A paper describes a structure:
The 22nd genetically encoded amino acid, pyrrolysine, plays a unique role in the key step in the growth of methanogens on mono-, di-, and tri-methylamines by activating the methyl group of these substrates for transfer to a corrinoid cofactor. A substrate:corrinoid methyltransferase catalyzes the demethylation of the specific methylamine, and subsequently transfers this methyl group onto an associated corrinoid protein. In summary, we have determined the structures of native MttB, and its complexes with a substrate analog, sulfite, and its physiological relevant corrinoid protein, MttC. These structures have provided new insights into the mechanism of activation of pyrrolysine that is distinct from the previously determined MtmB structure, and details of the key steps in the pyrrolysine-mediated transfer of methyl groups from methylamine substrates to the cobalamin cobalt in corrinoid proteins.
The 2.7 Å resolution structure of MttB-MttC complex was determined from crystals belonging to space group P21 with one full MttB hexamer bound to six MttC monomers with approximate D3 symmetry in the asymmetric unit. The electron density of the cofactor is consistent with 5-hydroxybenzimidazolyl cobamide, the predominant form of corrinoid extractable from Methanosarcina spp. grown on methanol. The cofactor is most likely in the pentacoordinate Co(II) state, as one nitrogen of His107 binds to the cobalt. In the native state, the helical cap domain blocks the β-face of the corrinoid, but upon methyltransferase binding, the cap domain is shifted to expose the corrinoid cofactor so that it can participate in the methyltransferase reaction. A similar positioning of the cap domain away from the corrinoid cofactor is observed in the MttB-MttC complex. This positioning exposes the β-face of the corrinoid cofactor and allows it to bind to the cavity formed by the TIM-barrel of MttB, thereby placing it directly over the pyrrolysine amino acid. The interface between the cap domain along with loops of core domain of MttC and dimerization loop of MttB provide the primary interactions that stabilize the MttB-MttC complex. Several MttB residues appear to undergo a conformational change upon formation of the MttB-MttC complex. The most notable of these is Met249, which adopts a conformation that moves its side chain away from the pocket in a fashion that appears suitable for facilitating TMA binding to pyrrolysine and its subsequent positioning near the corrinoid cobalt.
Residue numbers in the entry:
A (entry chain M): 3 to 216
B (entry chain A): 2 to 118, 122 to 495
C (entry chain F), D (entry chain E): 2 to 495
E (entry chain N): 2 to 89, 92 to 215
F (entry chain B): 52 to 101
The structure:
């Protein structure tokens, strides 16, 4: 059974079907199966098979997200039984991401979020126009390895400094490595601001996130 | 004698370009009407939500969703004027914007960087807006000015946007289209235009020298700012360009038809909100909408898709009876090479042949991140060739010129002809494009368009005189800008 | 349930470009018939003059001027086929040329120089038979280059042998695609016939049915057919070789400053050539062709990258359609001396118009310096431009499926379409350029901050190095090679 | 290579049927505006008369005649939505009604009798509430029957309770498809609203957004709206219930013998109804409907299977399109007393015209005996006829792929296409009737030498026996059932 | 691949109606030196019979049946010379064609293919086949049954001459004749004294098997 | 008759290739209409393009 529940969880993701992703997460609950087992032996297995083809140039962005959407359709089905109740953690880094406050551009942030999710990391999307304070509150509440903000304007890119500050005066700036990315964001900005990582793109961000903690 | 009496004759003036039939246009309209009901539009601004609600739209206050009924689109359209005139300080630069095929060009906006030619890019600042204004003031094909690059230097030290309003009107006498205003600050712009006209609000309204753009948040929702720009725009009599910017595969369907349905709904909902706030309000059905590159994770704005969508939005606007403002002469190139020229031409020729009332993009590079002063005059040179091409092929007895063929006869040439002499200025004559044989070219530096262009930039920026605003008047406008920074620091 | 039954619906597939009304096309036609009677057309070839005379034309033997009556123009047009297939050495490269809007591209011809890479930068060196071989290989690779056209002259064979015959075997040997000879010689048309006959194992009936070779000729503007032009036409029609009757007038120079008048001139010239072809052999395969442009009165040069060239080519396509014939026009041409911003602009301007107009063959690809040079860098760039142009030509398909309302509603407000089944299935639909760079500054700078020309060049190097062209059977080749040698001997015997 | 780049191409998708020119539609419009002012329209309902008067109409209180000015007709047309969605109990049965040529079919209503075979002899028995239940099940199964329309009267409830309210729950309970009430009662519209409100758990906002119930009304021809008609319209607009304003005039009877004049009459009647709807509530969902036919002056009957009915329905669809409204017309109707050769003819005649014309809803399926009877046998037969009609409506698609030249050449002279990949992949494309017999005599005789009617009947038996309809939640049903009971009590209290 | 995989790729070539795939497998077979008889019997025929099933279950129709027979023919044309240079099974051979003066053939081609897929080795003589050729084929191939197709009552008559000339050559007594066609009935068969009447293709198959 | 007018005729296969100019020629020659007479003039029926 378990082997079959992991065979499905994988098929669910390589096939890009949210339903089956919920089905398996269901027959999974109806077996007492540890959800963390399903999120790794089961879903991330297929998650990583896609990224594999993504790397060879067989599948593209569409497939990454479509697969990430499935992994979430399943994880949703068991978020109650999971961490909420049992309170168990997954593995392979934890990155909190969202578009800086005052900014609603989200396409990019969502692509970075998926490329990470598919790389093997646990992504926590904070949404967009995320108020600076929420970044901080989510950092000490979730205690993630990486905190990422996205800014696509020169006027919302400036708010990334505030993430650095309010994080320092929260006594957690040293508890997590920050990352900055966006069309106007550059390495110089990352340095000048004091950000740990600079994401040139979704691939560069994934490569640097692991090279920074992996 | 010769005929001087022909009967009914049908002619085509210029070049007509068709993408749709009436059935198809309606196909897209009906689809937009279904979408305006579901999911509908999310209007963040509560002032905007009340106007909609006061007029029939069923507004859900929990979700901020507005379902605009089709009769409000109709009523809105019946109200929006079909034409209006943008004004510059110099009447000669005045520009009409009317439902049809009357094409005009304006520059790109807004870049964060400015190309300086080797070739390097350096984050823009208010001083840059001053030059481009000088350069664009000289560029004949650039009908009016559009905020080209953000003055990042005034960013955080004052009302960046209010500064971005004074410098353009200052260094240019042509209409000024603000590509990125702040709703909260529309009052200032009004006061600046009003200050120009010596405090005569009537003059400011009657002769708008300042217009403004706003973008729907793709997909399907107007932000508090977009709404405030519209609403305020309509109360103050400032022409508003409701220009959406969806992305195929990203914020809208991968298909171009579906992407027009989403683009349409956004724009109309904006235009509906303008006409409801103040009937007869001047608006533009605009678009910069394009296709999102699923294999490059980028938003190419020089693809043949942007060219099509722009040309398609132009036809839609005509369908609805409104002026169009669309993306054109754009490139994804990072340097002025073959690719820039190609994309600049592809994305400009389509909406031009289609009838776009305003085509913005000139000067662009790198998907809109940079503004090249070289590409800008190259672009302006490309528009001359476009206008030529747009003259199509006039067919009259005079132009068929049978007698000339007969006068010159077999084996001769038409050079010594009077007709050839008198029409010397008719054939295209590019200012920058090189048509010399290798020898003369090579004897001039073996220079390519880029350098020949940069040499021009330097010459224009050094010898061109812009008409300055009278000192009395300027101080009055500067004051307001100062009053604006005051407040910014205050808060 | 969901509708699946709609009444008559009017659709426009693609992009339609209009330049004339029927009344206007008629105007140009009447103006031409007028010109064909006065001043008429000077036919230098006595044999052609006889064929004209035998069919009803008034022929003045002292001036050699022929006055073609409209009924012969009409007769010829009823005889000329609306379509014919250009065969390649490889059947998959077959290209149909037919009255309508089916567009195809071919490289330009013929340059006398070739852009190269020496101690840096691209320079220009006079063309040689080997350059034809390289360019042929490149073109065999370019997918948007339907067939091959003599790109440059085999200057190194001039005075040593039959240049035009070398300019025939070399291309055929280096490309499995159809070959269009841009500079044939009336006297040697038999050699081309024989070379194609050899290729088909001496089966002349096969050579006629699967023409892998076609040729072009130019009326001498204004209003006159040279002896060589008449021979190419006459022999062509008799040997079953597709002929491209391509006028090359110049507004202000050899024709009126006005584009319409220039079309009348161009029209008379081409129609006379077509009339000759049909009178020689009814049903002879012919192209209504043009490379007519405008003479720059202010520069004393023949700009071929101007908007007038695009307009004239687009107009000629419309005229060809009007007369029921396949069109062959200039496009993707530039006056730029180097592959820069200008090349890109001109190439796109002169290609977009005739393409949107429906020209059946647009030649110009690879050109630079007003036709004097051939750039392989520019050739692959043009090939990429054609992919973009082909995309633009798909217009905006409007159907219930494309309108995609259910998708819009499914995605809802504030979300994206990246993960929809719809989006994935169509990942290959959007334009996907091979050379045009769409990366953001960072990735681009990391790849070396390369402009399009250097990127194109690296591609050329890669193609010339790794591309394989279906070779001709070694035995068959010997036979074909023999004819060339035979032609060379004769040349020396002169 | 193979072309894959074509210039603008003009196409006609499907089959276009024309009856008028703009000038002609204008003629009918002007003639109607004329009629609307003289003699005007008699509005019996005082409340409607007031709504008309309040908006600018001249109202004579003694004669009750209303003269509607053209600006109100224009105003009303600007207010009416070009489309709206009819929801089913099951979302998959949702049907869009919009200005255009998107065609849909629904059964007819309302017969007073029902066909039922009894010992070989054809037999019709007066209709009862149960018949509505059976017919509703059958229609739920018929795929070409987009939505359900009150087929027959619940005669057995007459005088015992609220017939029209029973005629509401029964259908809704036996079909997951949208229900169109063919015979609503102005006074009881609240009950319908409540029954639909109950279904949606008392959520009136939901009931308005997902209308599973709509209703029809008939102007009393010539030129007058009854009180019931006005109430259905007024209440309908106020409760957010789609209303079908369906005229029912007769050439030679209640309107001119000339079809055009009959259209003017029909046009005035319907427009006044539509004007009322929009003045009551701007944006009210309405149908421009018709069942207008010709009165047989020589038979003193109202033939509804005649070519005039098909023409009038087709014309009304064109008019609806002209005015920008969705159309609802009669089609697939017959005067035949039994499912014979005549039924087949008339049913196809009266359906083909309005379908090719673009009527958005064609009702008539299942009808016989000029509207007096409902035949389940005939209903499944009509459903099959619509599949054939839908096929005919695909017209002749013309593209490079459909022209299939490569297939023709591949197969060559004297061979067949049975084994081509092309043929297999499209095996499901050709028309494939469910009941129409296409076998040769032998196979047919072996199956029992059955005519279409008996075959249809066996199908009816099979469907009624094995088809499953998505039942309504038992609790929700109780609430809905309550309203019916409440309505019944009130009826007895009268 | 190993014989096991080649045999499967050969069945798939059929179930997918893919001539190019049938030819490639045939080459993988010949290359491996594998016996052609095992490639046909356990390979194509496996996939050929599978189609027949799906056809008998209304899941597939004529297009599929003829395509499958053709995908198989492609791959066997490849391994034909081989089978020749080594010598070589059908339920029995069937010779068919439309009779003289009759160029109808779509059906004859269908009956023929409906047999190839059943098992019988069908020998198609074509269309407009003169009576003599019919006889001069019974003596050469000696197939279990000689079938004819007439769609015209005018050519249906020639179906007699096939009898009155196979007895004329003492061969009638060997092969069972068969007639079929739109105008052909069971009676006409009994009259001219033919062995089997072909109602439809399916029927013809079922009836030819009746003579087991 | 086909060969005599310009068509390519392969005598071994008996295949004829008709050039478009002959299709055009034939169409210019064929009458757009003709009358089918009956034994009774009143039954005359016109067949014409339209």
């Amino acid at each position: 059974n378990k082997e079959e529940i992991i065979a499905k969880a994988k098929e669910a993701i390589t096939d890009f079907d949210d339903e089956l992703a919920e089905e398996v997460a269901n027959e999974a609950l109806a077996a007492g199966i540890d959800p963390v087992e399903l999120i790794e032996k089961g879903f991330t297995a297929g998650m990583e098979e896609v990224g594999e083809k993504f790397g060879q140039g067989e599948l593209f962005l569409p497939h990454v997200l479509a697969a990430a959407e499935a992994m979430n359709s399943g994880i949703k089905v068991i978020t109650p039984e999971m961490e909420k109740r049992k309170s168990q953690t997954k593995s392979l880094g934890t990155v909190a991401i969202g578009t800086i406050e005052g900014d609603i551009h989200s396409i990019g942030k969502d692509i970075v979020a998926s490329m990470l999710n598919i790389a093997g990391f646990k992504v926590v999307d904070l949404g967009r126009d995320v108020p600076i304070n929420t970044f901080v509150e989510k950092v000490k509440e979730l205690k993630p390895q990486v905190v990422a903000s996205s800014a696509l304007m020169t006027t919302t890119m400036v708010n990334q400094i505030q993430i650095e500050e309010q994080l320092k005066e929260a006594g957690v700036r040293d508890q997590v490595k920050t990352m900055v990315g966006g069309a106007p964001v550059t390495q110089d900005w990352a340095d000048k601001i004091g950000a740990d990582i600079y994401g040139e793109s979704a691939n560069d961000a994934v490569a640097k996130v692991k090279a920074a903690l992996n | 004698a010769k005929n001087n009496a022909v009967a009914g004759f049908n002619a085509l003036n210029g070049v007509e370009l068709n993408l749709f039939t009436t059935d198809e246009l309606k196909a897209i309209h009906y689809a937009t009407m279904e979408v305006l009901m579901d999911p509908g539009i999310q209007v963040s601004d509560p002032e905007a939500r009340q106007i909609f609600k006061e007029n029939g739209c069923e507004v859900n206050e929990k979700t901020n969703v507005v379902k605009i009924p089709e009769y409000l689109v109709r009523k809105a359209l019946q109200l929006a004027p079909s034409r209006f005139v943008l004004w510059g300080r110099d009447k000669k630069f005045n520009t009409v914007q009317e439902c049809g095929g009357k094409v005009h060009w304006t520059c790109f906006g807004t870049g964060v960087k400015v190309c300086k030619y080797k070739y390097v890019t350096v984050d823009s600042v208010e001083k840059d807006i001053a030059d481009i204004a000088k350069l664009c003031d000289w560029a004949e094909n650039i009908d009016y000015f559009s905020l080209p690059v953000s003055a990042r230097d005034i960013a955080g030290q004052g009302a960046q946007d209010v500064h971005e309003t004074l410098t353009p009107l200052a260094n240019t006498a042509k209409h000024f289209h603000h590509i990125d205003p702040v709703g909260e600050n529309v009052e200032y712009y009004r006061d600046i235009v009003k200050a120009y006209y010596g405090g005569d609000e009537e003059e400011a309204r009657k002769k708008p020298i300042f217009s403004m753009l706003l973008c729907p948040t793709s997909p399907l929702e107007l932000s508090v700012n977009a709404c405030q720009v519209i609403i305020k725009g309509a109360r103050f009599g400032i022409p508003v360009n409701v220009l959406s910017m969806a992305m195929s595969g990203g914020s809208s369907p991968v298909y171009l038809a579906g992407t027009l349905v989403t683009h349409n709904a956004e724009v109309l909902s904006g235009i509906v909100l303008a006409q409801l706030t103040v009937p007869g309000a001047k608006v533009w059905y605009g678009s910069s909408t394009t296709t999102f590159d699923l294999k490059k994770g980028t938003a190419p704005v020089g693809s043949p898709e942007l060219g099509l969508i722009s040309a398609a939005v132009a036809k839609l606007a005509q369908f609805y009876g409104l002026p169009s403002y669309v993306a054109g002469s754009x490139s994804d190139a990072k340097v002025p090479d073959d690719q820039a020229g190609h994309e600049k031409t592809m994305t400009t020729l389509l909406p031009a042949l289609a009838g776009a009332n305003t085509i913005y993009g000139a000067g662009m590079l790198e998907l809109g991140m940079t503004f090249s002063m070289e590409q800008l005059v190259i672009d302006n040179d490309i528009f001359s060739m476009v206008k030529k091409a747009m003259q199509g092929i006039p067919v009259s007895e005079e132009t068929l010129a049978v007698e000339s063929i007969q006068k010159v006869g077999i084996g001769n040439n038409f050079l010594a002809l009077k007709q050839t002499r008198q029409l010397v200025d008719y054939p295209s004559n590019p200012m920058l494009l090189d048509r010399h044989m290798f020898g003369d070219w090579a004897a001039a530096g073996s220079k390519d368009l880029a350098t020949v262009a940069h040499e021009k930039v330097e010459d224009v920026l050094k010898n061109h005189q812009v008409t300055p605003i009278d000192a009395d008047i300027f101080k009055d406008m500067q004051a307001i800008v100062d009053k604006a920074d005051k407040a910014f620091r205050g808060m």
